[PDB]
Amino acid sequence: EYTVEDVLAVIFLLKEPLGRKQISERLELGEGSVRTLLRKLSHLDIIRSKGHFLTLKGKEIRDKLLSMFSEPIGVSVDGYPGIAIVVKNPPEFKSIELRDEAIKFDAKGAMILTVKDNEIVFPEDFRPLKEMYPEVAKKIVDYEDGDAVIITWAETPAKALKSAIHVAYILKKEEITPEILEVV
Query: Burial, 98: exposed, middle or buried (Cβ in 10 Å; 0-12, 13-18, 19+)?
Result: buried
Say how far apart CA 47 and CA 183 lie, in whole Å: 12
For residue 89, the SS3 value is coil
Cβ burial of 118 (10 Å; 0-12, 13-18, 19+) is exposed
Contact 148, 86 (CB under 8 A): yes
Contact between residue 168 and residue 160 where contact means Cβ atoms under 8 Å apart: no
Tell me yes or no: is domain 68-176 CATH 3.30.1600.10. no
For residue 75, the 8-state DSSP code is E
Domain residue ranges of the chain, discontinuous segments joined by +: 1-67+177-184, 68-176
In DSSP notation, 143-154 reads --TT-EEEEEE-
Instruction: Give, for 88, the enclosing helix (H) or strand (E).
Output: none
Resolution of this deposited model, Å: 1.8
Q: How many Cα atoms within 13 Å fall on the side-chain side of residue 164?
A: 32
1-67+177-184: CATH topology: Arc Repressor Mutant, subunit A (1.10.10)
- Give me the phi and psi of 79, to 5 degrees please: 80, 0
Q: What is the number of other CB atoms lying within 10 angstroms of the CB of residue 27?
A: 20
